[PDB]
Amino acid sequence: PLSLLIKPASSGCNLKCTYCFYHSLSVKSYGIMRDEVLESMVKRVLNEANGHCSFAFQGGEPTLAGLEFFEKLMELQRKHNYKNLKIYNSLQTNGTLIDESWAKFLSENKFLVGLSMDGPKEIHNLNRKDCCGLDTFSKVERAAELFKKYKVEFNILCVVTSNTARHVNKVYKYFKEKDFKFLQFINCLDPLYEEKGKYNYSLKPKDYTKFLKNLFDFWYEDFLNGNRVSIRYFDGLLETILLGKSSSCGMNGTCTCQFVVESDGSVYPCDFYVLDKWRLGNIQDMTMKELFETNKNHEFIKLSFKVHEECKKCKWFRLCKGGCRRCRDSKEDSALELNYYCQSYKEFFEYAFPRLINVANNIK
Ligand SMILES: C[S@@+](CC[C@H](N)C(=O)[O-])C[C@H]1O[C@@H](n2cnc3c(N)ncnc32)[C@H](O)[C@@H]1O
Ligand code: SF4
Ligand code: SF4
Ligand code: SF4
Ligand SMILES: [Cl-]
Ligand SMILES: [Cl-]
């Protein structure tokens, strides 16, 4: 099967989230993806894929490409899916531009949607402000309400900053109040290769430790009271515990090629690494196999197989596996270092492992 991460509005965005290094306003934007580039990609994937394929739309804010772009996508998928493959479409959105038309489209076409929401109003608005400085929380709530009204399948993407670590109670309680049961807490990354921990929002290892421990306590109490809440990190640990492998990139110890496609058709191995040094080629000119077998992609993946010496002697290695490579990549052109959050995982596991096992045993 083939899975692509597409940026149909490139890095363009209507917000300027304080911690965000993905958006163009003080990052290269290639503008909105042209129809001919979109068709070239869709035709290719559906010609080359076996079994099924997946198209994920991110950025940047992908809804800036407009609804017609997405209706064209669906027409092109129908046009070119001559093998009758199952297709999985998804979208990650800031939600601010979602209206009834969008919600109907997303429901009817069975998109899985990730909606970015950092917590209740003040926690969310602290960092997630629009390009004119305005608060955005009410608009994101409006999106969630529309998704609920129109039956859109969605989950929540919450960035974990230092402020999140000081207010796990408020964040957890808010999501619980809204009955959001599918949550993904994303460690806030400082910009690649910059000195770490320098911003007011920076998630330092001690902050992450505090975050993990308290989040786990809330989640486990819910588990004990028969309230199932899905948290992606914990689900991934459970997969590793029960299956020896996780469905989430960054928890299996080595990298994968994610086939990130910019709006000009240029392809990259990972959405953290949309940079000229990791440009694989252009989806209009190269087969997916070709892109995968480029020395740049081979190098990208092979770099990730190096195991730090501490991990070799770590009692948690089989559970942690060294974490995501992006958290090990401290300086350009340099060998990977020990995971930035190593100490956080170690103190979290001491605190939570036995209870994790209990959960693992009760879900078979
Ligand atoms: C880059 S956005 C693109 C899609 C859409 N604009 C949105 O905000 O959901 C995808 C996800 O990355 C998250 N993100 C942004 N900056 C981040 C950072 N520095 N570290 C970790 N995640 C970040 C966003 O909050 C969002 O959940
Ligand atoms: S809305 Fe998404 S892409 Fe835009 S600045 Fe915020 S996190 Fe970045
Ligand atoms: S850097 Fe992390 S998210 Fe990207 S491919 Fe490697 S493990 Fe996966
Ligand atoms: S906890 Fe630290 S030493 Fe142990 S495997 Fe994870 S990163 Fe390596
Ligand atoms: Cl608001
Ligand atoms: Cl998570």
CATH superfamily: Aldolase class I
Quaternary assembly: monomer
Proportion in β-strands: 5-15%
Largest sheet: 10 strands, mixed
Can you list the strand order of the major beta sheet? 7-6-5-4-3-2-1-8-9-10
Q: How many E-type strands?
A: 10
Bound ions, cofactors and other small molecules, one mention each:
S-adenosylmethionine, iron/sulfur cluster, chloride ion
Please bin the fraction of helical residues.
40-55%
Structural class: alpha/beta
Secondary-structure element order, N to C: EHEHEHEHHEHHEHEHEEEHHHHH
Find the CATH topology: TIM Barrel
What is the CATH first-level class name?
A: Alpha Beta
Count up the helices: 14
- CATH structural architecture: Alpha-Beta Barrel
| Shape assignment | globular
End-to-end separation in angstroms reads: 29 Å
How many distinct folded domains?
1
Nearest-angstrom radius of gyration? 20 Å
PDB class: oxidoreductase
Keywords: AdoMet radical fold, oxidoreductase
Assembly: monomeric
Entry title: Native anSMEcpe with bound AdoMet
What does this molecule look like?
It catalyses: L-cysteinyl-[sulfatase] + S-adenosyl-L-methionine + H2O = 3-oxo-L-alanyl-[sulfatase] + hydrogen sulfide + 5'-deoxyadenosine + L-methionine + 2 H(+). S-adenosyl-L-methionine binds at residues 19, 60, 116, 128, 189. Pathway: Protein modification; sulfatase oxidation. Its EC number is 1.8.98.7. This protein has 364 residues and is an alpha/beta fold. It has one domain (1-364): Aldolase class I (TIM Barrel, Alpha-Beta Barrel). It has helices at 35-48, 67-80, 100-108, 121-127, 137-150, 162-166, 168-177, 205-224, 232-243, 288-293, 295-303, 309-312, 317-320, 342-362, and strands at residues 2-6, 52-57, 86-93, 112-116, 153-160, 182-187, 230-231, 260-261, 266-268, 281-282. The protein has a 10-stranded mixed beta sheet. Helix 3 packs across helix 5, helix 8 (205-224) packs parallel to helix 14 (342-362) and helix 9 (232-243) crosses helix 14 (342-362). The longest helix has 21 residues, at 342-362. The two termini are 29 Å apart. The protein binds S-adenosylmethionine (SAM), iron/sulfur cluster (SF4) (3 copies) and chloride ion (2 copies). One iron/sulfur cluster binds next to loops.
